[PDB]
Enzyme design. Structure first.
Site, PDB file in Angstrom:
ATOM      1  N   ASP A   1       0.840  -1.187   0.000  1.00 60.36           N
ATOM      2  CA  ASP A   1       0.000   0.000   0.000  1.00 60.36           C
ATOM      3  C   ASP A   1       0.881   1.244   0.000  1.00 60.36           C
ATOM      4  O   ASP A   1       1.939   1.272   0.633  1.00 60.36           O
ATOM      5  CB  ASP A   1      -0.886  -0.006   1.245  1.00 60.36           C
ATOM      6  CG  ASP A   1      -1.643   1.292   1.431  1.00 60.36           C
ATOM      7  OD1 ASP A   1      -2.054   1.895   0.416  1.00 60.36           O
ATOM      8  OD2 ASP A   1      -1.827   1.712   2.594  1.00 60.36           O
TER       9      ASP A   1
ATOM     10  N   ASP B   1      -0.992  -0.820   5.913  1.00 65.71           N
ATOM     11  CA  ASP B   1      -1.296  -0.282   7.233  1.00 65.71           C
ATOM     12  C   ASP B   1      -2.786  -0.160   7.536  1.00 65.71           C
ATOM     13  O   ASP B   1      -3.139   0.169   8.674  1.00 65.71           O
ATOM     14  CB  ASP B   1      -0.627   1.087   7.426  1.00 65.71           C
ATOM     15  CG  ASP B   1      -1.228   2.157   6.544  1.00 65.71           C
ATOM     16  OD1 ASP B   1      -1.504   1.868   5.360  1.00 65.71           O
ATOM     17  OD2 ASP B   1      -1.433   3.287   7.038  1.00 65.71           O
TER      18      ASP B   1
ATOM     19  N   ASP C   1      -6.603  -2.765   3.696  1.00 64.10           N
ATOM     20  CA  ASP C   1      -5.568  -3.736   3.369  1.00 64.10           C
ATOM     21  C   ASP C   1      -5.813  -5.100   3.998  1.00 64.10           C
ATOM     22  O   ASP C   1      -5.161  -6.070   3.597  1.00 64.10           O
ATOM     23  CB  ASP C   1      -4.198  -3.208   3.799  1.00 64.10           C
ATOM     24  CG  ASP C   1      -3.755  -2.012   2.985  1.00 64.10           C
ATOM     25  OD1 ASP C   1      -3.903  -2.048   1.746  1.00 64.10           O
ATOM     26  OD2 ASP C   1      -3.262  -1.035   3.585  1.00 64.10           O
TER      27      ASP C   1
END
Ligand SMILES: CC(=O)C1=C(O)N2[C@H](C1=O)[C@H]1c3c[nH]c4cccc(c34)C[C@H]1C2(C)C
Ligand SMILES: [K+]
Ligand SMILES: [Mg+2]
Ligand SMILES: [Mg+2]
Length: 992
Positions: free
Chosen positions: A351, A702, A706
């Protein structure tokens, strides 16, 4: 109701038959309560400890050893009462290892945290609804909200459900979508319908999603979906899905178990056909029950010899000792097997926000006006440093350090940034880092004022908390903000009306404006040059935007804000602030001061880690929720792309990816390094395709968005600054948020894999040598050379010490220059299987020959009788052909302790040959690994302690070999090193 974002607020209200003023009634709620149930995320309970220990016993190879446990318990049940103490040692030590490995396997794979609990934290306890039984707003649990309810949402509240916006009561409504979108910036919402039902969640501005919070504003709406129908419900539907993924080493050892179980069964029948007939003429040696006692004793010995007991101990020992080595690097491993998987990973998904970038917005660049000549103006470009909200940094002008207290154009620029702000800086005493208050965009300006320090305020001897607002408090003492013109979507800007405090009679009111550069400077009729004022020229305004265009669309790709001020603002009474449309008229004739660019900076060690994975053959693919332009800009910085590289086919968005046919989606996952504006469901959908290609994926998020990609990935990685949901969904957590731990964990994961398969072959080669020994004595008919009680001590204590030391073997120098290994590759090769078979056959003959030596050598034993040795079961006193020899010599410990010393000494030799695969022992000295030499000495001295310590040799049935018999076992065992060295020479210098 779904896809209501494509329908007007009147159509959605007409679907449920509800009046937006009075909301649902009580009778209609009960009818909707039945069909849609309560609004909550159902919880997924975890498997208890009693159920996980059962699944350890369900393995086919475990049931083989469990079968031998009951057979040895029956064999120990028929033993004479005098030997009973030594008889039950076998079934208990078998049952001891059986239960020991059962709990170790559970403690290894158990996940002690549940992601659904962390996801249910985003469900608010209460909600605000309008219903027909009360004339005003009511407050009820979010559990009682049904689709069709009319709800009111205010600032600070968490959205109880998925809601179609009806009327926005404030000027603008701002929402934090970082749950679904992963981005912390607020989004402007409207009530207008959104076409294109295929549009992602980031593109729907008329909807509110459950779990999100309201940054500012107030509005109302109607509830489209509750419970599992929401977008957060789509997350937990992918959380509850678990395929019981197993690391490639666990996957091949699981297959090797069923491959070994077939051999043990065939070898039992292989001995059964060579077994002399007990139903015809075994000289009636025993009763009909005594016939099957030998077949049970040989099968137990075959199971204990073939099955490598203690293997779960050395593997778990290597994982725990590797987990500790990673914890020193600030990597928390939440699944022990996952330290090995990271060695073979061929791709790393990451990410952008919060992982590749600091998630904290900072001002990268700024500029003001320098000189004006005719229609052309020159600008002074400044750059600001630092990646964090920490008010630290230094301004540089043309690659030289400069203090901005002497630039009057910059002082007024910092004046606008501090005076027009809804945000603030805050220092967390617990976390020890500076946090943000309010909008992250406006907070980036707050840090800029502190880092600029235009007034030279003394910052020494000041507390960390006082240091946050220190430079802002000075400007607050100077100018008093009377009111604020709210940000409106039409003009794309905002302003504040401030009057000076100290220059009471020598100064007059002014108005500071900030907003989008296009909409602001078009309303700017002048330019601020130093402290002077010059009219705005079409040639000057063309040069000003020429810079702001290169900042927004360039390789920098920064967000920009035009900073302007009104020197002679309109009078107080002349402004009526109820209508927001009049604000664009109130802000006009502005003087352009400057413009400030800002960016979410990438982390310092990310760009270096990408270059290292590239040398290791590991791809990196950015999957974010941010826009495609910003993502590609980050990819060019960190090294995923090139500055001049063509991203046309290498970058896709959420809707573009879904629009492709499944054949075109496959090619994208291979060649595309960037995916932007991605729904959380698409994050797992991308990883799912990489797994279909037989690739080992690593996903580091994080965010809550996700979580699906983390759980779906074979090994997930989480940031310590990330949310609790992202932590419970992964197998690894970076506490210090250092991305260089990822490349350090791949190196640590490859060194373990090379050592793991090395002692896996060492223990698996020791078992084939014990099967040949027990199969050869059964074919020839000699007395037992090795008792399964002795074999367990060899399989666990004797061979476990050097096997654990084999995990400490020094890694390769270039190990990080190798591409990832094939996940489907076999554990043994064609030449390696022939070698382990040739080695296993020599040790099998060396232990059987050791028992035949003590009998045939006639030193201390009887003389040589071959016909009496194989027929020894036919020995009974008074029978001829046994004249001269005692019938009790066959049960003596001397032949067994002769074979046991040969077995242990050879295992100390094979432990030394296991340093390097094809390299010799002279070019790779034995002292390269100190733990291996120390393990051989301890294992060899433990072979003495089993003999000498009083109670031990009675159960193991062994005696010391004195002086001479050890010289026979040392000269017979040593050729193992010479034999293996020859098989290494032809493979090294000839075969390949
Ligand atoms: C009760 C318990 O959990 C277990 C065990 O008790 N074991 C292992 C095992 O899983 C067995 C096993 C399964 N697959 C392989 C591959 C290679 C070696 C082994 C195994 C050793 C097995 C044994 C009996 C030690
Ligand atoms: K996972
Ligand atoms: Mg197990
Ligand atoms: Mg993020």
């Amino acid at each position: 109701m779904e896809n209501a974002h494509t329908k007007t607020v009147e159509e959605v209200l007409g679907h449920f038959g509800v009046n937006e003023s009075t909301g649902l009634s009580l009778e209609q709620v009960k009818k909707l309560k039945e069909r849609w149930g309560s609004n909550e995320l159902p919880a997924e309970e975890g498997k208890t400890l009693l159920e996980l220990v059962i699944e350890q016993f369900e393995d086919l190879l475990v049931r083989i050893l469990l079968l031998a446990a009951c057979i040895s318990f029956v064999l120990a049940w028929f033993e004479e009462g005098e030997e009973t103490i030594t008889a039950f040692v076998e079934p208990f030590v078998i049952l001891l290892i059986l239960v020991a490995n059962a709990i170790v396997g559970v403690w290894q794979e158990r996940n002690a945290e549940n992601a659904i609990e962390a996801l249910k934290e985003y469900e608010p306890e209460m909600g605000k609804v309008y219903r027909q039984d009360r004339k005003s707003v009511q407050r009820i649990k979010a559990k009682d909200i049904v689709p069709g309810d009319i709800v009111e949402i205010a600032v600070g509240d968490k959205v109880p459900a998925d809601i179609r916006l009806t009327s926005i009561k404030s000027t603008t409504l701002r929402v934090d979508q970082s749950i679904l979108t992963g981005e912390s910036v607020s989004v402007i919402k409207h009530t207008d319908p959104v076409p294109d039902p295929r549009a992602v969640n980031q593109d729907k501005k008329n909807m509110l999603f459950s779990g999100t919070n309201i940054a500012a504003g107030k509005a109302m709406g109607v509830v489209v979906a509750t419970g599992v129908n929401t977008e957060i419900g789509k997350i937990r539907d992918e959380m509850v899905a678990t395929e019981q993924e197993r690391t490639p080493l666990q996957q091949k050892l699981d297959e090797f178990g069923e491959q070994l179980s077939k051999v043990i069964s065939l070898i039992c029948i292989a001995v059964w056909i060579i077994n002399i007939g007990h139903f015809n003429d075994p000289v009636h040696g025993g009763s009909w029950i005594r016939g099957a006692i030998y077949y049970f004793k040989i099968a137990v010995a075959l199971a204990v010899a073939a099955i490598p007991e203690g293997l779960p101990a050395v593997i778990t020992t290597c994982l725990a000792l590797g987990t500790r080595r990673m914890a020193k690097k600030n990597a928390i491993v939440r699944s022990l097997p996952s330290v090995e998987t990271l060695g073979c990973t061929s791709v790393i998904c990451s990410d952008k926000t919060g992982t590749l970038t600091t998630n904290q917005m900072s001002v990268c660049r700024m500029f003001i006006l320098d000189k004006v000549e005719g229609d052309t103006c020159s600008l002074n470009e400044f750059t600001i440093t630092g990646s964090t909200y920490a008010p630290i940094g230094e301004v540089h002008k043309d690659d030289k350090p400069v203090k901005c207290h002497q630039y009057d154009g910059l002082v007024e620029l910092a004046t606008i940034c501090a005076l027009c702000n809804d945000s603030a800086l805050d220092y967390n005493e617990a976390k020890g880092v500076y946090e943000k208050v309010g909008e992250a965009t406006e907070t980036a300006l707050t840090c800029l004022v502190e880092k600029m320090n235009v007034f030279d305020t003394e910052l020494k001897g000041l507390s960390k908390i006082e240091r946050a607002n220190a430079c802002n408090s000075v400007i607050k003492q100077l100018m008093k903000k009377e009111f604020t013109l709210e940000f409106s979507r039409d003009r794309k800007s905002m302003s504040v009306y401030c009057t000076p405090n100290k220059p009471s009679r020598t100064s007059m009111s002014k108005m500071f404006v900030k907003g989008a550069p296009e909409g602001v400077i078009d309303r700017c009729t002048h330019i601020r040059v130093g402290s002077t004022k010059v009219p705005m020229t079409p040639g000057v305004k063309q040069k000003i935007m020429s810079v702001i265009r290169e900042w927004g669309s360039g390789s920098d790709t920064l967000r920009c804000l035009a900073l302007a001020t009104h020197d002679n603002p309109m009078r107080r009474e002349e402004m009526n602030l109820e209508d927001s449309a009049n604000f664009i008229k109130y802000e006009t004739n502005l003087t352009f001061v400057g413009c400030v660019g800002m960016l979410d900076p990438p982390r310092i060690e990310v760009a270096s880690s990408v270059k290292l994975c590239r040398q290791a053959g590991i791809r990196v693919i950015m999957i974010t929720g941010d826009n495609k332009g910003t993502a590609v800009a980050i990819c060019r910085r960190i090294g995923i792309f090139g500055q001049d590289e063509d991203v046309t086919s290498k970058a896709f968005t959420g809707r573009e990816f879904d629009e492709l046919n499944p054949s075109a989606q496959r090619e994208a996952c291979l060649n595309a390094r960037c995916f932007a504006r991605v729904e959380p469901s698409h994050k797992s959908k991308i990883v799912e395709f990489l797994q279909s290609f037989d690739e080992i994926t690593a996903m580091t998020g994080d965010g809550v968005n996700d979580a699906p990609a983390l759980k779906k990935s074979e090994i997930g990685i989480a940031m310590g600054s990330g949310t609790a949901v992202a932590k419970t969904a992964s197998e690894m957590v970076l506490a210090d948020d250092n991305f260089s731990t990822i490349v350090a964990a791949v190196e640590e994961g490859r060194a373990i894999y090379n050592n793991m398969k090395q002692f896996i072959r060492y223990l698996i080669s020791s078992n084939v040598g014990e099967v040949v020994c027990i199969f050869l004595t059964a074919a020839l008919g000699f007395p037992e050379a090795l008792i399964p009680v002795q074999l367990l001590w060899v399989n666990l204590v004797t061979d476990g010490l050097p096997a654990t030391a084999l995990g400490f073997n020094p890694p390769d120098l270039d190990i990080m220059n190798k591409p990832p290994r094939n996940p489907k590759e076999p554990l043994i090769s064609g030449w390696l299987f022939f070698r382990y078979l040739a080695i296993g056959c020599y040790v099998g003959a060396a232990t059987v020959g050791a028992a035949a030596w003590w009998f045939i050598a006639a030193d201390g034993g009887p003389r040589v009788t071959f016909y009496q040795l194989s027929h020894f079961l036919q020995c009974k006193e008074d029978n001829p052909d046994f004249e001269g020899v005692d019938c009790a010599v066959f049960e003596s410990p001397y032949p067994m302790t002769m074979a046991l010393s040969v077995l242990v000494t050879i295992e100390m030799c094979n432990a030394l040959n296991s340093l390097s695969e094809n390299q010799s022992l002279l070019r790779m000295p034995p002292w390269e690994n100190i733990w291996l030499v120390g393990s051989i000495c301890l294992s060899m001295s433990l072979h003495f302690l089993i003999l000498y310590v009083e109670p031990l040799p009675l159960i193991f049935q062994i005696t010391p070999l004195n002086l001479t018999q050890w010289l026979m076992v040392l000269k017979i065992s040593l050729p193992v090193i010479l034999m293996d060295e020859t098989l290494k020479f032809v493979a090294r210098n000839y075969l390949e």
